Amino acid sequence: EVLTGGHSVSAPQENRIYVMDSVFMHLTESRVHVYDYTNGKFLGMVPTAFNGHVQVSNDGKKIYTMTTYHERITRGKRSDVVEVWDADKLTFEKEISLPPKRVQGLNYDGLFRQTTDGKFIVLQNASPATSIGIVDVAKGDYVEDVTAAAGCWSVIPQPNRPRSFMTICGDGGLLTINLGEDGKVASQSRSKQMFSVKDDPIFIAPALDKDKAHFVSYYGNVYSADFSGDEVKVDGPWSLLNDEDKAKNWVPGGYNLVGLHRASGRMYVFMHPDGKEGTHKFPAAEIWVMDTKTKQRVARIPGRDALSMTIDQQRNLMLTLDGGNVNVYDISQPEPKLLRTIEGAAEASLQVQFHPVGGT
Amino acid sequence: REVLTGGHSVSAPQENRIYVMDSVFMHLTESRVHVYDYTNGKFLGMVPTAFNGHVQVSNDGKKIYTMTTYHERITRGKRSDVVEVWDADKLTFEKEISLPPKRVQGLNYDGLFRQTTDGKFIVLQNASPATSIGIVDVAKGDYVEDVTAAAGCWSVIPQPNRPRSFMTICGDGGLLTINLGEDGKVASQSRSKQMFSVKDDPIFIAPALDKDKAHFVSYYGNVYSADFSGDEVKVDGPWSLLNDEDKAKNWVPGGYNLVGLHRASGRMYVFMHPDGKEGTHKFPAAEIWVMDTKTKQRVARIPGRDALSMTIDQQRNLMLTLDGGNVNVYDISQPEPKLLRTIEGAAEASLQVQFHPVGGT
Amino acid sequence: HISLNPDLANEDEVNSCDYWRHCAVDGFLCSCCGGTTTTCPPGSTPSPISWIGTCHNPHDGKDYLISYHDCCGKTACGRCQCNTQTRERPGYEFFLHNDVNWCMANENSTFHCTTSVLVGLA
Amino acid sequence: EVNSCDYWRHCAVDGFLCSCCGGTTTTCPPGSTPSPISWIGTCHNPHDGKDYLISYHDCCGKTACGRCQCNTQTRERPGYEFFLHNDVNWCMANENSTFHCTTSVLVGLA
Ligand SMILES: *NC(=O)Cc1c[nH]c2ccccc12
Numbered sequence A: 001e002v003l004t005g006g007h008s009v010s011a012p013q014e015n016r017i018y019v020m021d022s023v024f025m026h027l028t029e030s031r032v033h034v035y036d037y038t039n040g041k042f043l044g045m046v047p048t049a050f051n052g053h054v055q056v057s058n059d060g061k062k063i064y065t066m067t068t069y070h071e072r073i074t075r076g077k078r079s080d081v082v083e084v085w086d087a088d089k090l091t092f093e094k095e096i097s098l099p100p101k102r103v104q105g106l107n108y109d110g111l112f113r114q115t116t117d118g119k120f121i122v123l124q125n126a127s128p129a130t131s132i133g134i135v136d137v138a139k140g141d142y143v144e145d146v147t148a149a150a151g152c153w154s155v156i157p158q159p160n161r162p163r164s165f166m167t168i169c170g171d172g173g174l175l176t177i178n179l180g181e182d183g184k185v186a187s188q189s190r191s192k193q194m195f196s197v198k199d200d201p202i203f204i205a206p207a208l209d210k211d212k213a214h215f216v217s218y219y220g221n222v223y224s225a226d227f228s229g230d231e232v233k234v235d236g237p238w239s240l241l242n243d244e245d246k247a248k249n250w251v252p253g254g255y256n257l258v259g260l261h262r263a264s265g266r267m268y269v270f271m272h273p274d275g276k277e278g279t280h281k282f283p284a285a286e287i288w289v290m291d292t293k294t295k296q297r298v299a300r301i302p303g304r305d306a307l308s309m310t311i312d313q314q315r316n317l318m319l320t321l322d323g324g325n326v327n328v329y330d331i332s333q334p335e336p337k338l339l340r341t342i343e344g345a346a347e348a349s350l351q352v353q354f355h356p357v358g359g360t
Numbered sequence B: 001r002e003v004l005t006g007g008h009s010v011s012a013p014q015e016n017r018i019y020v021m022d023s024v025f026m027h028l029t030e031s032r033v034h035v036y037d038y039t040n041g042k043f044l045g046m047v048p049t050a051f052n053g054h055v056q057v058s059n060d061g062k063k064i065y066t067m068t069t070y071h072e073r074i075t076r077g078k079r080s081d082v083v084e085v086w087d088a089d090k091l092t093f094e095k096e097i098s099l100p101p102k103r104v105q106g107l108n109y110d111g112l113f114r115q116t117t118d119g120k121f122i123v124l125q126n127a128s129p130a131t132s133i134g135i136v137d138v139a140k141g142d143y144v145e146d147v148t149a150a151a152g153c154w155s156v157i158p159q160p161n162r163p164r165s166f167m168t169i170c171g172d173g174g175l176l177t178i179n180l181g182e183d184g185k186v187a188s189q190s191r192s193k194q195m196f197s198v199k200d201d202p203i204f205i206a207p208a209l210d211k212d213k214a215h216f217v218s219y220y221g222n223v224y225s226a227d228f229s230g231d232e233v234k235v236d237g238p239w240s241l242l243n244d245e246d247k248a249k250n251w252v253p254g255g256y257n258l259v260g261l262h263r264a265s266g267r268m269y270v271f272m273h274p275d276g277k278e279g280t281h282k283f284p285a286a287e288i289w290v291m292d293t294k295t296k297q298r299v300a301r302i303p304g305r306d307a308l309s310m311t312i313d314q315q316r317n318l319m320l321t322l323d324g325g326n327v328n329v330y331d332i333s334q335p336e337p338k339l340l341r342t343i344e345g346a347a348e349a350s351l352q353v354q355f356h357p358v359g360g361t
Numbered sequence C: 001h002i003s004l005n006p007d008l009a010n011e012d013e014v015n016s017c018d019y020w021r022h023c024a025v026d027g028f029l030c031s032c033c034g035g036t037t038t039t040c041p042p043g044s045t046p047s048p049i050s051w052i053g054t055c056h057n058p059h060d061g062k063d064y065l066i067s068y069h070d071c072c073g074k075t076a077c078g079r080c081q082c083n084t085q086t087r088e089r090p091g092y093e094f095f096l097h098n099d100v101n102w103c104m105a106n107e108n109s110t111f112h113c114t115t116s117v118l119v120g121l122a
Numbered sequence D: 001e002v003n004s005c006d007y008w009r010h011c012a013v014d015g016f017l018c019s020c021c022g023g024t025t026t027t028c029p030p031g032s033t034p035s036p037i038s039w040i041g042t043c044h045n046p047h048d049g050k051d052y053l054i055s056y057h058d059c060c061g062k063t064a065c066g067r068c069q070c071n072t073q074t075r076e077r078p079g080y081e082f083f084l085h086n087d088v089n090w091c092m093a094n095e096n097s098t099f100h101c102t103t104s105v106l107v108g109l110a
C-alpha cells in the first residue's frame, strides 16, 4: 500500500454541513468540521486559527474563512484575513488582506456574509467603532469600507437583489446598502424605526425570506422588514405568545435562534419558560413553529437544549445545535421530525450551515 | 473606584512553584505551561508555548526557557523553531533564540530539553529525522552548532559533577559523553562500553540521576548504571527490581518520566504494573516502588494512582506524580512516601511536571 | 464593606459566576487565572476598552456600574468560565454587548480572562 | 472495526486514526499531506497468523483531528531505535509539521 494525498471529500456536496467549532477553551485553534448530515460521518476540516468565522460560497465551489494571525500568536504583528479554500479538496487557495479590525466574537451568521450573487464578501468590523467591509472575491481585495454603518451591527443579505444587504442600527431601524458591480456603495437608504432599542430589543438573527425578514425580541415579539421595494417597510410587533404562554413567561433564547421555511412561511424559534432579564441566551426548552401569515403558533416540540439552528430550503431540513451535538430534523410538514443526532460534532460551536445547493 | 492593572508578579514565592507542561494534544498548537503552588493547589499563571512546547527552568531560578515551533500561518508558511526566555516572576517574554528547523517534536521527556550544570548552555534534541544535539549559548542568545557526534543517539543526561558535560544514549546500547568548551562547541568526547542490549533488554530513557552516576530501568524490570565519577564512564547491570513473587505476577516498569532518585538516601522511585508483556511499557502505574540502590532491595510499595510521570525535589524531599491531568504531592523524607494532596485538573494532557529550583549549587 | 472589596472576601465566593458583580461576564474569571478581580494574571495586559453595565449588590441593596475589562495577550485561561447576561444587549448597543472580544483593540488581541471592575454607584 | 484502536494493523499507533478523520487507512483526509517518513510497527494478523510490517505515516499540515485517539505500543522502542519509536511527530520533516492524524500502511510480510 502507499499513502496518498490530494483527495476530495468523499460525500456529495448536497450531504455536507459545516460546524464552526470555536474551541473557546483553546480559541487559537478554532476550526470548521465538515460532516455528512445523512449518516453523521466526519468528512474533513478546515483550520481557522483564532476565532475563525466561516461561510460557503453561494455557488458551492469554495469555502471562505475569516481569521486573525499574529507572527508569534500572542505577540508580533497582526494579520486579519479572509481565506479562500477549495470546497472539495479542503485546501487553501488564497489569502485576502483585511484591515486589522475584523470582528472577533461569537459566530452569528450576520458577522460574515456574502451578496446574493456571490461576488462580494460582506463582513462586520469593530475597532471598536463599527463599519462593514467589502471583499471582491474575484480580485482577492478589500475594496470598500462602509462607514455609513457606524453604530450598526450585522449583515442581512437581500435574497431578491444581487448586491444588497441590510444592517440593524442604533436607532432601531435598518440601513440598506446596495453595492455597485465594483463593490463600492452604489446607493443606500434608512428605514423608519422598526423596534424600540430600550423597550423591546430584537435578536439580530433574521428569519430570512426572499423579500422580507422577521426578527424576534427579548420579550417574544416579532418585527418584520419588507424589502420587496427599494425602500424597506417595517412593522411589528406581533406577539409569539398567547395568554397561556404569558402565564409561564415563555420567551425566546439562543444565538442563531430562528429560521424560516420559505415555501410555507413557517418560522422556527427557540423558546424557554420562566423568562426574565438575563435569560436571552438560554438553551431551548422547545422549538415553536409559527405561521407568519396568520401570526399564530402551529406546533411546538422539545428543544434538546439547542442554541443555534439553520434551515435547508430545498430538502426541507432544519439543523439544531446545543454547542456540541447537531440534531437533524425533517421540516417538510408543520411538526418537525427528528431524524438523527450527530454527537460530538464540536467542542464549542454556536453555528452550523448547510452546503449551498441552490446556485447563483 | 477600581482600576485593572497589569505588570504583576506571581503571587506565591518561587519555592512554592511547580510547572505542569500541558501539551493539550487535542489542540497541540495551543500547548502551554501551567504554574501551580504545590503547597495548596492554587493556579498561579501560565506561559503559552504554541505547537508542542517544551519547558525547563533556568538552574538559577530566574528564567523559564521554552522551546517551540511557529509557522507564519500556523498550518502553512515558513517554520521558526525557537527557544524563548521568559522572566519567571513576571511570566513575560524576554528573548527569542532562533534554532535550525529540526528541534524535536514529541512528548515531553525531560531529556529532550536540558541545560549544562553551570547553566551556560541549553542542550536540546534535534531530529530531522537525523538526530543531533543542539547547543544554545544563553549569554549570547545564539545557537552554537549541532553535535553531529550524537547521530543515532537520543536524549540528554547532564553530568551534575561537571560544568558543561552531558551524556546521550546510543543505538549501540552505550553512552556517548560530550564535554563542551567555553564557546559551547565540543571540546572532547568519549563512548562507553555497551551498557544494555538494545534487542534483549531495552532501557527507558529517563534517568534516575545522581551527582556522579545514573541508573536506568528496562522494559523487563532490570536496572543498569553509568558511573561518571572518573575520567570515563563505567557501565554495569543488570540487577533486577523483581523478587520471585514479583516475577510470577509479571511486574514491570511503565510510564514516561517514570523514575526518580532521591540522592541523599540513594532511593530510586519507579512506576510499576503487573501482567507485563510486549506493549505495556507506557501503562499507568499500579504501584510506585521504592528501591535502595545500594542494597538493591525494595523498601516500599504504594498505590500508583495511575501515574505516568514524576519528578523529585532534593531540597525539600518531595516527589510529584502526574497521571496526565492531576498532580499528586508526596513527602519522601522516609522510605515510605506519604501522600499530601492531589491537585486536580492541573492539565488536560501533561506528561511532565517540574519544580521551580531552590538552591542546588 | 466586604461586599465591595473582593480581596477581603472568601475566594470561593468571588470565583463564582453567581458573585454579584459578575452579572454580565462572558469568559474566564481572572481571579481564577492567577490574578485578582482587579489585577491581570502575570504577563497579561488589561484592555483599554470594555463592555459595561450595572449590577445589583444584594449585600448593601445598591446598584453599581461595572466595567468588564479583559486581560489579553496570553492564550485562554480555561478556568471559571461564566456566561451571565443580566442587562446584556446585542451589538447595536455595542458597549453593553458581551459576545465580542473586548481585547479587540489590544496590541495582542488573544483573549486570556475577563473580570468585573467596580466603577461606582449607578 | 478499522476505526477501533484494537484493529490489528494499529498495533503501534500513537495518534488519531485517519480513517476516523475523513480519510482511510491509506489515504490522508482532504487537504492534509502525507509524511515521507514514519515509524514502523510489526503487527500480528489474527486471520492468517503472520506478522506484517506496518508503516505509520502521518498526515500533516492541518490541526489535530481529535477523533479515534489511540496509544498502542506493540514492539515500540525508545528514540535510540528511532524508526521504531512513536512518541515523536512523524510530520517533523514535512513542509508543515502540524500533526493531523496517523495512517496504518501495510508494507508486506515481516
Ligand atoms: N468578554 C470577552 O471578551 C471574552 C469573549 C466572549 N466572547 C468572545 C468571543 C471571541 C473572543 C473572546 C470572547
Ligand SMILES: *NC(=O)Cc1c[nH]c2ccccc12
Binding pocket: B052, B105, B106, B107, D013, D014, D015, D056, D058, D086, D087, D088, D089, D090, D091, D099, D102
Ligand atoms: N504518530 C504521530 O506522529 C503523532 C504524535 C505522537 N506523539 C506526538 C508528539 C508531538 C506531535 C505529534 C505526536
